[PDB]
């Protein structure tokens, strides 16, 4: 039933852009990333890469990725699609421009596939942190505990909660179209695609053509080697210049919509309760920083919130009205006084 998303699959094409830190510098990688949404709880991150992986050229090979190299696209294997942070991540799912993965906390996020003879990596600076849902500020999803209503990105892809617009792309330059005709510059076409064309010298001023030659200018460096190729539209990225004509249709659903799932949260060890005369002593040992809250049941609340990390001993004046305390994400408990 994965063939009901052809609007993303067919109407969209692979895309390339300014990666800020492509390898050792700022090259123009085919997998330039943008709008990483690290706002869930379970450590999952949604990344919108410029490359649009999904089905193959026509309709098949979900397990293949299709990026754009030079003038043309190239659908190849997805063998070494790598997503990294301060520590290496682990892929979960991918669809269209968006790839869903979970990462450990870190200061930067990197994405890189493998063509096989090439590395082709890209990264960006972006704070990534993940506080688990609950009162126990842990740092890795535990094996057991109690469940709470966290916020997490949907594991599925066939959803239409939100949409992203895909208009016609804007013309890209490519001076390799400007071949040499022994003494003049000679532009040639990819498939009959539109080539907006003109040089600093006065010559052909629009360019909507097959392979033209240049009468006036000679050096390729002063000529508009542009390709208007909106046979397959792209997302209105901030790294691609705008098509002056119009913003075409192609409203595309967001693949991984955040949903309110139920993550499994940690549970702190139960405190050792020791009773005295009209005072409650809580002998406890926290495994990870947990805040405990106390609240008197009388007219005056006298609340107290205190995160504790090292093992500590605390006291509480339990009045005749009574006292209640919440240690970690355990259910609240109340107490008497004689």
């Amino acid at each position: 039933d994965l063939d009901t998303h052809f609007t993303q699959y067919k109407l969209a094409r692979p895309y390339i852009a300014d990666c800020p830190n492509c390898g050792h510098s700022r090259c123009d990688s085919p997998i330039a990333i943008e709008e990483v949404r690290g706002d869930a709880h379970a450590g999952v991150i949604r990344i919108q890469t410029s490359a649009m992986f999904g089905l193959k050229t026509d309709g098949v090979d979900l397990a293949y990725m299709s990026f754009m190299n030079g003038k043309t696209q190239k659908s190849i294997k997805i063998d070494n699609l790598h997503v990294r942070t301060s520590a290496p991540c682990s892929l979960v799912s991918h669809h269209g421009y968006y790839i869903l993965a979970q990462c450990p906390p870190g200061d930067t996020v990197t994405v890189g596939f493998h063509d096989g003879p090439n590395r082709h990596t890209c990264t960006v600076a972006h704070k990534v942190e993940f506080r688990p849902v609950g009162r126990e500020k842990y740092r890795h999803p535990p094996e057991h505990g109690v469940e709470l209503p966290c916020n997490r990105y949907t594991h599925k892809r066939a959803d239409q909660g939100h949409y992203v617009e895909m208009h016609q792309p804007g013309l890209v330059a490519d001076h390799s179209l400007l071949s040499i005709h022994s003494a003049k510059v000679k532009i040639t076409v990819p498939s009959g695609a539109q080539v907006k064309y003109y040089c600093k010298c006065p010559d052909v001023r629009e360019g909507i053509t097959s392979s033209d030659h240049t009468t006036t200018c000679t050096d390729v460096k002063q000529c508009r080697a542009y390709l208007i190729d909106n046979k397959k539209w792209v997302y209105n990225s901030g790294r691609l210049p705008r098509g002056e004509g119009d913003t075409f249709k192609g409203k595309l659903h967001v693949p991984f919509v955040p949903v309110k799932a139920k993550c499994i949260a940690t549970l702190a060890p139960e405190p050792l309760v020791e009773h005295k005369h009209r005072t409650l002593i809580l002998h406890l040992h926290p495994d990870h920083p947990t805040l405990l809250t106390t609240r008197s049941l009388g007219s005056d609340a006298n609340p107290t919130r205190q995160w504790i990390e090292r093992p500590t001993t605390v006291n509480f004046t339990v009045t005749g009205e009574g006292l209640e305390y919440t240690w970690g994400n355990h259910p609240p408990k109340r107490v008497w006084a004689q």
Binding site: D39, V254, V257
Partner: protein
């Protein structure tokens, strides 16, 4: 020349996670009362606190309230975040300072 434009649009996450501002009034309180008097030994009545409404579940009929204390833990301005309630003073609509 470059013509760059940008506008702020609410995130996709707003559909699930979003704070809710609330201004509250006195309202009217309700109670569930169980009366196991006499020989019937049972009741399961939901009742109000206004000093007029009768409650005539089973055979007996009674009237409850009004409460002696108008104490309301809620303040005039209340902020609700998903599951927990905070009596934070949200400024007003259309006046929020940036960053705050």
């Amino acid at each position: 020349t470059q013509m760059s434009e940008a506008y702020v649009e609410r995130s996709e996450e707003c559909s699930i996670d979003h704070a809710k501002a609330y201004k509250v009034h006195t309202g009217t309180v309700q109670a569930m009362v169980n009366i196991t008097y006499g020989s019937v030994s049972w009741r399961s009545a939901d009742v109000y606190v206004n000093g007029e409404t009768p409650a005539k579940i089973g055979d007996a009929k009674l009237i409850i309230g009004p409460l002696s204390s108008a104490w309301s833990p809620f303040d005039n301005k209340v902020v609700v975040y998903g599951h927990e309630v905070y009596n934070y003073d949200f400024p007003e609509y259309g006046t929020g300072k940036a960053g705050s």
